[PDB]
Design an enzyme around this catalytic site. Sequence first.
Site, PDB file in Angstrom:
ATOM      1  N   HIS A   1     -19.101  55.180  81.403  1.00 45.89           N
ATOM      2  CA  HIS A   1     -20.557  55.257  81.248  1.00 45.89           C
ATOM      3  C   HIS A   1     -20.875  55.128  79.762  1.00 45.89           C
ATOM      4  O   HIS A   1     -19.977  54.900  78.937  1.00 45.89           O
ATOM      5  CB  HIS A   1     -21.191  56.461  81.952  1.00 45.89           C
ATOM      6  CG  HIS A   1     -20.866  57.782  81.382  1.00 45.89           C
ATOM      7  ND1 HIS A   1     -19.739  58.480  81.737  1.00 45.89           N
ATOM      8  CD2 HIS A   1     -21.573  58.601  80.557  1.00 45.89           C
ATOM      9  CE1 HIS A   1     -19.746  59.646  81.111  1.00 45.89           C
ATOM     10  NE2 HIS A   1     -20.866  59.756  80.400  1.00 45.89           N
TER      11      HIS A   1
ATOM     12  N   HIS B   1     -22.172  57.132  77.313  1.00 45.19           N
ATOM     13  CA  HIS B   1     -22.168  58.194  76.325  1.00 45.19           C
ATOM     14  C   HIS B   1     -21.031  58.012  75.316  1.00 45.19           C
ATOM     15  O   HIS B   1     -20.032  57.288  75.559  1.00 45.19           O
ATOM     16  CB  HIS B   1     -22.099  59.567  77.020  1.00 45.19           C
ATOM     17  CG  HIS B   1     -23.339  59.952  77.758  1.00 45.19           C
ATOM     18  ND1 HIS B   1     -23.331  60.904  78.754  1.00 45.19           N
ATOM     19  CD2 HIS B   1     -24.626  59.587  77.582  1.00 45.19           C
ATOM     20  CE1 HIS B   1     -24.566  61.082  79.181  1.00 45.19           C
ATOM     21  NE2 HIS B   1     -25.374  60.308  78.476  1.00 45.19           N
TER      22      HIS B   1
ATOM     23  N   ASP C   1     -18.584  59.849  74.368  1.00 45.89           N
ATOM     24  CA  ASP C   1     -17.245  60.206  74.829  1.00 45.89           C
ATOM     25  C   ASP C   1     -16.578  59.115  75.666  1.00 45.89           C
ATOM     26  O   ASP C   1     -15.405  59.279  76.029  1.00 45.89           O
ATOM     27  CB  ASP C   1     -17.214  61.546  75.555  1.00 45.89           C
ATOM     28  CG  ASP C   1     -18.094  61.657  76.800  1.00 45.89           C
ATOM     29  OD1 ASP C   1     -19.178  61.054  76.861  1.00 45.89           O
ATOM     30  OD2 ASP C   1     -17.760  62.478  77.714  1.00 45.89           O
TER      31      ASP C   1
ATOM     32  N   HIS D   1     -23.682  62.204  87.061  1.00 50.65           N
ATOM     33  CA  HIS D   1     -23.783  62.602  85.670  1.00 50.65           C
ATOM     34  C   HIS D   1     -24.665  61.655  84.862  1.00 50.65           C
ATOM     35  O   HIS D   1     -25.392  62.083  83.952  1.00 50.65           O
ATOM     36  CB  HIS D   1     -22.372  62.657  85.080  1.00 50.65           C
ATOM     37  CG  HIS D   1     -22.359  62.752  83.612  1.00 50.65           C
ATOM     38  ND1 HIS D   1     -22.564  63.933  82.932  1.00 50.65           N
ATOM     39  CD2 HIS D   1     -22.213  61.805  82.673  1.00 50.65           C
ATOM     40  CE1 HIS D   1     -22.545  63.693  81.637  1.00 50.65           C
ATOM     41  NE2 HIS D   1     -22.298  62.410  81.455  1.00 50.65           N
TER      42      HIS D   1
ATOM     43  N   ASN E   1     -23.355  68.455  80.331  1.00 54.24           N
ATOM     44  CA  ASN E   1     -24.558  67.892  79.728  1.00 54.24           C
ATOM     45  C   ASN E   1     -25.242  66.983  80.743  1.00 54.24           C
ATOM     46  O   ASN E   1     -24.743  65.890  81.077  1.00 54.24           O
ATOM     47  CB  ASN E   1     -24.225  67.181  78.425  1.00 54.24           C
ATOM     48  CG  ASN E   1     -25.448  66.827  77.666  1.00 54.24           C
ATOM     49  OD1 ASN E   1     -26.479  66.505  78.247  1.00 54.24           O
ATOM     50  ND2 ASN E   1     -25.351  66.877  76.337  1.00 54.24           N
TER      51      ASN E   1
HETATM   52  C1  LIG Z   1     -21.073  62.886  74.687  1.00 52.73           C
HETATM   53  C2  LIG Z   1     -22.176  63.404  75.611  1.00 52.73           C
HETATM   54  O1  LIG Z   1     -23.396  63.001  75.069  1.00 52.73           O
HETATM   55  C3  LIG Z   1     -24.423  63.295  75.970  1.00 52.73           C
HETATM   56  C4  LIG Z   1     -25.777  62.850  75.507  1.00 52.73           C
HETATM   57  C5  LIG Z   1     -26.902  63.464  76.261  1.00 52.73           C
HETATM   58  C6  LIG Z   1     -28.264  63.597  75.539  1.00 52.73           C
HETATM   59  N1  LIG Z   1     -28.584  62.533  74.581  1.00 52.73           N
HETATM   60  C7  LIG Z   1     -27.478  62.518  73.597  1.00 52.73           C
HETATM   61  C8  LIG Z   1     -26.051  62.512  74.107  1.00 52.73           C
HETATM   62  C9  LIG Z   1     -22.023  64.938  75.533  1.00 52.73           C
HETATM   63  C10 LIG Z   1     -22.294  65.691  74.364  1.00 52.73           C
HETATM   64  C11 LIG Z   1     -21.978  67.075  74.345  1.00 52.73           C
HETATM   65  C12 LIG Z   1     -21.435  67.750  75.443  1.00 52.73           C
HETATM   66  C13 LIG Z   1     -21.227  67.015  76.643  1.00 52.73           C
HETATM   67  C14 LIG Z   1     -20.713  67.358  77.908  1.00 52.73           C
HETATM   68  C15 LIG Z   1     -20.214  68.705  78.358  1.00 52.73           C
HETATM   69  C16 LIG Z   1     -20.854  69.872  78.042  1.00 52.73           C
HETATM   70  C17 LIG Z   1     -20.324  71.067  78.516  1.00 52.73           C
HETATM   71  C18 LIG Z   1     -19.156  71.172  79.250  1.00 52.73           C
HETATM   72  C19 LIG Z   1     -18.596  72.523  79.716  1.00 52.73           C
HETATM   73  S1  LIG Z   1     -19.282  72.970  81.349  1.00 52.73           S
HETATM   74  C20 LIG Z   1     -18.782  71.746  82.560  1.00 52.73           C
HETATM   75  O2  LIG Z   1     -18.743  74.215  81.825  1.00 52.73           O
HETATM   76  O3  LIG Z   1     -20.753  72.946  81.274  1.00 52.73           O
HETATM   77  C21 LIG Z   1     -18.500  69.990  79.538  1.00 52.73           C
HETATM   78  F1  LIG Z   1     -17.339  69.936  80.280  1.00 52.73           F
HETATM   79  C22 LIG Z   1     -19.010  68.770  79.072  1.00 52.73           C
HETATM   80  C23 LIG Z   1     -20.707  66.177  78.640  1.00 52.73           C
HETATM   81  C24 LIG Z   1     -20.421  66.002  80.092  1.00 52.73           C
HETATM   82  O4  LIG Z   1     -20.916  66.880  80.880  1.00 52.73           O
HETATM   83  O5  LIG Z   1     -19.967  64.899  80.497  1.00 52.73           O
HETATM   84  N2  LIG Z   1     -21.142  65.178  77.879  1.00 52.73           N
HETATM   85  C25 LIG Z   1     -21.478  65.636  76.635  1.00 52.73           C
HETATM   86 ZN   LIG Z   2     -21.664  61.551  79.749  1.00 49.76          ZN
HETATM   87 ZN   LIG Z   3     -18.781  63.546  79.456  1.00 47.04          ZN
END
Ligand SMILES: C[C@H](OCC1CCNCC1)c1cccc2c(-c3ccc(CS(C)(=O)=O)c(F)c3)c(C(=O)O)[nH]c12
Ligand SMILES: [Zn+2]
Ligand SMILES: [Zn+2]
Length: 232
Positions: free
Chosen positions: A85, A87, A89, A150, A181
């Site tokens: 996707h 993002h 990561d 997601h 997120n």
């Molecule tokens: C790189 C990505 O950018 C997202 C954008 C959204 C808004 N606009 C800007 C960027 C990103 C940034 C920071 C954290 C995450 C997370 C994330 C957060 C918390 C946990 C622990 S948990 C399951 O217990 O909640 C976890 F496993 C993963 C995930 C994801 O969920 O895939 N993706 C993230």
């Molecule tokens: Zn993502």
């Molecule tokens: Zn992610």
Amino acid sequence: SGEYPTVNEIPVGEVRLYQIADGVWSHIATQSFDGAVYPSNGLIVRDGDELLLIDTAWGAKNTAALLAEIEKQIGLPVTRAVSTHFHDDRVGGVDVLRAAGVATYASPSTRRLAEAEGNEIPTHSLEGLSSSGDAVRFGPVELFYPGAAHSTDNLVVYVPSANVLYGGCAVHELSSTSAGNVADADLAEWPTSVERIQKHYPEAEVVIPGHGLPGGLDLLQHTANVVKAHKN
Ligand SMILES: C[C@H](OCC1CCNCC1)c1cccc2c(-c3ccc(CS(C)(=O)=O)c(F)c3)c(C(=O)O)[nH]c12
Ligand SMILES: [Zn+2]
Ligand SMILES: [Zn+2]
């Protein structure tokens, strides 16, 4: 020393590999985002005498470190990469890959979203994935579009030789207590998309989340559960 690596073992900038099955590894890196540190996973699949990479290691320097770690541990060239996707990561590091001669791929939906957000953009478009339930072959994997979860563009990856299901960020680890997120998520469609994964890949033996520890098929139901409780 053999357990699945975590942040506590992963300074940001370093990458570890974990053998999942014959010819299948995950890669694990850590990154800072909005003042917190997170692990994330990707996949490496042996493709004869080459390697297919699934997802970057979340950043340019992490992705350079990933390529160096692959050379050290595996020693076969990464020739292609798929980002699951839009993002950072998943695509952050695509410019590094592209300058190292790796051909980078993503769906048109991922490419458009990456472009609009200002993220790095894979070079090549993966057609045949625009409707939920669609699947295509890509070297030693099958790519599957389960529907919005997601993110609207999230893809999952199956390794048929090993019955490995790489869920990416549509799938959460068993210890999770929240759905990560969710800014770009569709919480109402996510359980239906997970149900599609469960129906399509009932023989999966290892399930790998986008972040955290691999397990078995239970990760799929657990993900639906945590998403339903988040929505509510
Ligand atoms: C790189 C990505 O950018 C997202 C954008 C959204 C808004 N606009 C800007 C960027 C990103 C940034 C920071 C954290 C995450 C997370 C994330 C957060 C918390 C946990 C622990 S948990 C399951 O217990 O909640 C976890 F496993 C993963 C995930 C994801 O969920 O895939 N993706 C993230
Ligand atoms: Zn993502
Ligand atoms: Zn992610």
